[PDB]
Scaffold this motif. Structure first.
Motif, PDB file in Angstrom:
ATOM      1  N   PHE A 191       9.672  19.182   7.708  1.00 29.49           N
ATOM      2  CA  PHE A 191      10.492  20.052   6.884  1.00 29.49           C
ATOM      3  C   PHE A 191      11.782  20.381   7.616  1.00 29.49           C
ATOM      4  O   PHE A 191      12.314  21.488   7.513  1.00 29.49           O
ATOM      5  CB  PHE A 191       9.707  21.307   6.496  1.00 29.49           C
ATOM      6  CG  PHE A 191       8.407  20.999   5.807  1.00 29.49           C
ATOM      7  CD1 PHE A 191       8.368  20.766   4.440  1.00 29.49           C
ATOM      8  CD2 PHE A 191       7.229  20.900   6.534  1.00 29.49           C
ATOM      9  CE1 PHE A 191       7.172  20.463   3.805  1.00 29.49           C
ATOM     10  CE2 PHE A 191       6.032  20.597   5.909  1.00 29.49           C
ATOM     11  CZ  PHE A 191       6.002  20.377   4.540  1.00 29.49           C
ATOM     12  N   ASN A 223      -9.017  11.310  12.393  1.00 33.91           N
ATOM     13  CA  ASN A 223      -7.653  11.697  12.754  1.00 33.91           C
ATOM     14  C   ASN A 223      -6.916  10.548  13.437  1.00 33.91           C
ATOM     15  O   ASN A 223      -5.725  10.321  13.214  1.00 33.91           O
ATOM     16  CB  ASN A 223      -7.638  12.936  13.653  1.00 33.91           C
ATOM     17  CG  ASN A 223      -6.226  13.400  13.977  1.00 33.91           C
ATOM     18  OD1 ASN A 223      -5.587  14.102  13.185  1.00 33.91           O
ATOM     19  ND2 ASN A 223      -5.730  13.009  15.146  1.00 33.91           N
ATOM     20  N   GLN A 267       7.561  16.175  -4.225  1.00 35.96           N
ATOM     21  CA  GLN A 267       8.304  14.942  -3.979  1.00 35.96           C
ATOM     22  C   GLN A 267       7.513  13.745  -4.500  1.00 35.96           C
ATOM     23  O   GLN A 267       6.325  13.865  -4.797  1.00 35.96           O
ATOM     24  CB  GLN A 267       8.605  14.791  -2.486  1.00 35.96           C
ATOM     25  CG  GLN A 267       9.211  16.039  -1.857  1.00 35.96           C
ATOM     26  CD  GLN A 267       9.530  15.862  -0.385  1.00 35.96           C
ATOM     27  OE1 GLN A 267       9.953  14.789   0.045  1.00 35.96           O
ATOM     28  NE2 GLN A 267       9.326  16.920   0.397  1.00 35.96           N
ATOM     29  N   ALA A 295       1.466  18.639   1.182  1.00 29.74           N
ATOM     30  CA  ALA A 295       2.740  19.161   1.666  1.00 29.74           C
ATOM     31  C   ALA A 295       3.932  18.529   0.961  1.00 29.74           C
ATOM     32  O   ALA A 295       5.067  18.945   1.180  1.00 29.74           O
ATOM     33  CB  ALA A 295       2.860  18.973   3.171  1.00 29.74           C
ATOM     34  N   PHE A 296       3.672  17.537   0.115  1.00 29.64           N
ATOM     35  CA  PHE A 296       4.744  16.788  -0.545  1.00 29.64           C
ATOM     36  C   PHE A 296       4.530  16.597  -2.051  1.00 29.64           C
ATOM     37  O   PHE A 296       5.035  15.636  -2.643  1.00 29.64           O
ATOM     38  CB  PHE A 296       4.939  15.437   0.153  1.00 29.64           C
ATOM     39  CG  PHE A 296       5.387  15.564   1.588  1.00 29.64           C
ATOM     40  CD1 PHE A 296       6.735  15.588   1.907  1.00 29.64           C
ATOM     41  CD2 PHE A 296       4.462  15.673   2.618  1.00 29.64           C
ATOM     42  CE1 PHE A 296       7.155  15.710   3.229  1.00 29.64           C
ATOM     43  CE2 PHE A 296       4.878  15.802   3.942  1.00 29.64           C
ATOM     44  CZ  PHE A 296       6.225  15.815   4.247  1.00 29.64           C
TER      45      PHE A 296
END
Lengths: 114, 114
Positions: free
Chosen positions: A57, B93, B60, B56-57
């Motif tokens: 970000f 991960n 978009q 988080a997007f």
DNA sequence: GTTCCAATTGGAA
DNA sequence: GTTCCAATTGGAA
């Protein structure tokens, strides 16, 4: 007596009643309990582990969160890694998550305030 | 004419020469080597562990990534958790990271091309 | 077959 | 005054 327990080399303390009742078999929960004992929720909601902005970000208008007291964080990592046998990275990840959790809760309470 | 070792119960195989030489002392390195043996670069650069977009997007329109073959991923997790004594989360991960790494390299090589 | 890291996010359980 | 997860990012090393 309410005896304070020193949890690490920097003498960050929590009450014995809290320290002795932590389940040291679950790293993340132990970390969360220490965090809410040592820091108020507002601090957790407005700070981060590193104080660095998210790379994801960059060039945005997100608030820049300052780092949590490094000496206190060092003590939390000391205590959890010595009692849970978790890696330092595992403890730090739990702190990151808890800070994000408290931030979410702060955002909710601000919505109510208008 | 080589021995193909099954790394997990879904029978995902790698050459024995690769298996015997993997760095099983570092979870992420073992995982990465298994991934580049089992999937090609194009797949790693365009797929993800879950095939779900980032929370988080959501506002978009990021490129879609398909899910890496689940049977093969399950076998990679099996192999690494057993031979490195890492957690399943740790292995997953490492896969997320390697996929992101190859996606980055693909993008870099494009700029480089033009 | 660069390797690893942490801040942010929506939402399941 | 919850807990935990995985995708995306720039950049250290």
């Amino acid at each position: 007596d309410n005896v304070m327990v020193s949890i690490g080399p920097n003498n960050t303390c929590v009450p014995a009643s809290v320290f002795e009742n932590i389940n040291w078999s679950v790293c993340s929960l132990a970390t969360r309990k220490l965090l809410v004992t040592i820091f108020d929720r507002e601090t957790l909601a407005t700070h981060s582990v590193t104080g660095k902005p998210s790379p994801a970000f960059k060039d945005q208008d997100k608030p820049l969160k300052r780092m949590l007291d490094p000496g206190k964080i060092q003590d939390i990592i000391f205590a959890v890694t010595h009692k849970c046998n978790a890696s330092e990275k595992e403890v730090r990840n739990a702190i990151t998550t808890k800070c994000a959790d408290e931030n979410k809760m702060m955002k909710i309470q601000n919505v109510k305030r208008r």
